[PDB]
Ligand binder design. Structure first.
Ligand SMILES: [Ca+2]
Ligand SMILES: [Ca+2]
Ligand SMILES: [Ca+2]
Ligand SMILES: [Ca+2]
Ligand SMILES: [Ca+2]
Ligand SMILES: [Ca+2]
Ligand SMILES: [Ca+2]
Ligand SMILES: [Ca+2]
Ligand SMILES: [Ca+2]
Ligand SMILES: [Ca+2]
Ligand SMILES: [Ca+2]
Ligand SMILES: [Ca+2]
Lengths: 135, 134, 136, 136, 135, 134, 136, 137, 137, 135, 134, 137
């Protein structure tokens, strides 16, 4: 399948998951140090163990969208629609803090659902599908 | 809430929440005239079981109508609905309510059962709308 | 409504594997023509086929429904730019993906894949695909 | 024993939805005559009907079995004073209750309704009704 | 359906559940204060939170039977048969304390089973079906 | 236990408990002659699986017989049985035992699977009897 | 390979209850000849038979498959020295054991019996038996 | 139950849960706490986020503040509470509780036990229960 | 394990469960307690009620009385037990335990923690386990 | 069925479970006192309650094999093959300590699986099927 | 590991463990040439799902081959396989791998789904082999 | 969190879990403990047995030894730890823990509470967590 595809003035992205190394993002360790403090890493062992994977995965998904979108000539505010899949909606507050770092001005249109699982296995906690309006 | 991109309008998934802060959960949360319309029965056991979903569905569809009115269109300009359920057994109720808003020809439709929607498990139905309005 | 044109795009209702002439859910290799069975990967061994037949046959009906729906409107698989694909069991993905390759020889679509609980009309539907077409 | 008179009362065995001429469990609108389908609320839409058909058809077979059993003994639905009604899923109640209204136009019976785990012969039976008749 | 129906010398009642206001009885608060002390309310927060709903629901069901029966010209000792449905038989001791307040002399015939659910939803913990012998 | 109301006698639901204080749970809790009758097999695995329900069923039915004798009737005056099971898979065993007490024509019958009966989960079968004895 | 001789022993593949001429899983008394039904313990009562029929019929097909497989190689049930027997529900054991008695009138085999989760081709197979034969 | 009890230089609290001593209400979200305490627990103003984080934040705060007020009614301050035993229905809630606990121990935190149990009184909607021990000569 | 232990003015008990130190029996109902203690726990004489309430009442009593007897073997009385930690398999059992606890603290009750856990030693039939702390100069 | 059967130079045993008195072995109490210390009984109440049933059942199964095998003229080292069924593989360390008492020299060939249940009910934790090579 | 008894050789149940101390769990734990052979696809989602079982199956079968070589035979001397799965849905993958080791005529076969094998739940397949080698 | 804390003659430890203060690793089997400590926990050398017993033995040892080392950093020895509260995910693991605890209290064991809870920090792979109280004048 195609990372993104252009159709008229719209760009459709595939659903994107937190993978790089072939690994699945699973904690702060997987992300650049400046970003950690930016996601809210506290330095406390137990707090970072819990919040870390969701924060890291959410960042990785959102940054991959930003890169994929740019590599087609757009910026984050060209994204009209987000469809967001979770294994656990109680993770939403964590996702929402990260999404704030990518949409500081006008937020995209949003669909948010809890599903069972996504590819390639159950450790994926978040998948985002993006739609871009860029003539 | 909504956004224009060329001739299309895209809506956020709408959930049956009062914008009371509360989740709609029964005939009492909808105006008297419409209860009769959703198929309210009067009898207590029946309306206890059907009322949450009918009310929730109507709430969501009407929210969609109004948002589309406030953008220039009516319901027939809604061409694609993505519809999320906690329980597909509710679908017959939902399809009854939707036939109220599309009496002629329905839109393109997607229907899946998912686990939960925001903001909690009492929400039985979410609809995401796509409008074509040049 | 099974499809609707808006501008350059055509939108398809989500498609499930229904035997459109018996009103029942496709359930195995018996629901597909003999030479298509070889194509889907049928092996001839009772148990292998009992196990793969449902997802493979269901995947064929969905994708071939999409192909025919698009063919009839003048378009092609390469015009079907986007697929949203709902599974009851992601373990069926390799099977589904073997079939999807058959339908997209040159221009693969953009893809989203999730496991949900269930689809219409009941729990024996294993795969559902929502297709989006760009055809000026 | 499907029924037994004791004094003024007649007692019926609990009744399940069995196709009495094929020995199988009623499973949808196909098991009922076409004009009765409209009466039960069939809509013509594939998925709505797939979902309501079983409980509605099962409810019809049970209630119509009771009606016929009572008719044959000289009585009427108004003589069927008491019903005990067992469900696998109380969410089916609105459907069942739509059908029960059909059988009781003037004198509704006394009613008990519970969700139990299961009934004979297997888990596809959705509804079972025990009827009690007063007929001097 | 019919609250009760007369057939010869017998009166059949419908199964009765704890509803009034359209609410489902769910604690001591739903019952008259003299009755609370009578059901065994302790005044302790945690004890009353647990015992309360079952005690209150049981009383409400039994009193509705007493009223329905009287409104047909009988008293509690005219009830021959009780069929009693529970979501949880571990609630039986609570039910049994209340039933003692309605049958102090000779107890009716009894059938007692745990079922899954009753109408109109899962918060109903007790439903009683009564049969009356009253020529 | 039982009560007269006109020509009918009504019985409390009977459970398979010794009136030892204990729940009957196997062939050992029933007299030697009847074991052969319930279909006891001699082999250990089989009788371990069938014995609880056969014994329990027999215990309950016999309790019903005696209560009906102590009121003037025999089994044929029992016209309606309501029968509660923890597991309908047990029904075939139960139906075998019941055919012992109604060799000719069975009574009017209701059969459901419920969750539990008193006084705990080891009780597999409860029967409520209704007698017609003018 | 359904069987293989090595020296004096013949080894059988595990055997499941498949209707070998319709490719489907045996499911009740209807899958067995009428006089064999009496032998298996059919009672004529709808619900008793609905409940015992599957395990009894499945047990007959498995054991009779073994008998025929062994008969065709010159041997007998007394030559079938060892059985490994897999169940989905050990509560079916008394039924299975009633049928196994039929096949072993003089020299019963050595026996292992376990409850596992599942067998091929799907979850409706209730019983599977692996047989080992000593036939010089 | 005794709210607290002295024994030598020690004061032992009963395990505390987020219930109104008045209403008898279980604390269920932001609406049950002082307005500026909300943005102090990290409320965002977003409906869905606040619905998800509200209950654990509110209950934690309510419990921790109870401890404070109780400790006050015996002469001591938050910093004399040296031991906490903290019981959760769901340890995924820990980061939320930890945010709140920092607000009460800005300087040096107490000794700490944290376990996930099945349930606390009076029902399953109670997400956190803390037991406090005080050293106060 | 040490039944109890002194440390300054304090005596700490091991968590106690309803087992016979003799038989090795787990207490399972009324039949395991002194006859007049039965109607003192609220036995009704009804078979089914007593089967349902018997085990929690009997186990609670057995545990609480153990505490008493232990506390006695060190010179103290029930009223010097100032802290209890109480562990349940099922908090729906709380009203039963609370009835019993009143019988041991008729005057002023102790400091109290109550949680529902999954299991206690030696098996799942143990419904209640109490841990006691004593102040006794 | 047949406790064991001879076929050429091989002896097949039936799967064997811990039964005597018709009871199912369920603790140290069911086994001879010298053996208890030999299985690792500590004397501590809680330890013996947990380890006891698996240790006792494993011993009973293995000793019954030794007796059945001897009663056909062989010794434990005539057993070539063990097939071992468990309700819970976390019991394996306990089984393995006991098996060491029966195979001190060369261990038999081994198949080990967790199954759901065995005959006659769920309290059986171990069943062993043995195969003997004894011309 | 194995034992001779007359003309037969009996093998211990083999599990897919490296003798690294680790459980094999994906294509990466098998040599490049064989990945192509097991049906490795290159695409990431597919190979993530098929790779554990194919790798595990191949690991187990090859272990069997080598053990049989180190005793004088080849694969065709393996006449009976007992095959244990955590999930029978894996069987098609397993049957593909096994067809690699028995290209002509398969051996006598037993296939059940069990709960777990040693040493933990990540092991998806265990095979017990019986060899006939005079 | 404070590792330990003094209050009068008492020292209270935070509940301890089997994590490396260095790596941040959760202890998962024999490979995480000193080699001769393995056969001291009862390692057999068998692959399958050691895989099954390794994690509980290793985690118990790691936790108990932490307690020791901590107690040392305040001047006391294992025998001044008079109270332990021990939390398990699975009490079937108790015999393993008990073996290990004997190695630290060869003479007279401490006061003891043992319960099965659902989970401990930081995740579900933690099988045992012990809380220690010390008397040390
Ligand atoms: Ca949730
Ligand atoms: Ca469903
Ligand atoms: Ca069933
Ligand atoms: Ca219960
Ligand atoms: Ca399956
Ligand atoms: Ca509130
Ligand atoms: Ca609860
Ligand atoms: Ca006892
Ligand atoms: Ca347990
Ligand atoms: Ca396990
Ligand atoms: Ca490690
Ligand atoms: Ca967790």
């Amino acid at each position: 399948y195609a990372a993104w595809r252009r159709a008229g003035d719209f760009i459709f992205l595939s659903g994107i998951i937190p993978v790089n190394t072939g690994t699945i993002v699973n904690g702060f360790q997987d992300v650049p140090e400046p970003v950690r403090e930016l996601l809210g890493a506290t330095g406390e062992f137990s707090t970072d163990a819990k919040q870390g994977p969701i924060l890291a995965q959410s960042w990785y998904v959102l940054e991959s969208i930003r890169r994929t979108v740019a590599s087609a000539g757009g910026q984050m505010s060209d994204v009209i629609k987000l469809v967001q899949y979770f294994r656990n909606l109680d993770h939403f507050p964590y996702y929402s803090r990260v999404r704030k770092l990518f949409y500081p001005d006008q937020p995209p249109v949003s669909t948010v659902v809890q599903v069972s699982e996504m590819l390639p296995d159950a450790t994926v906690l978040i998948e985002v599908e993006a739609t871009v309006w860029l003539p």
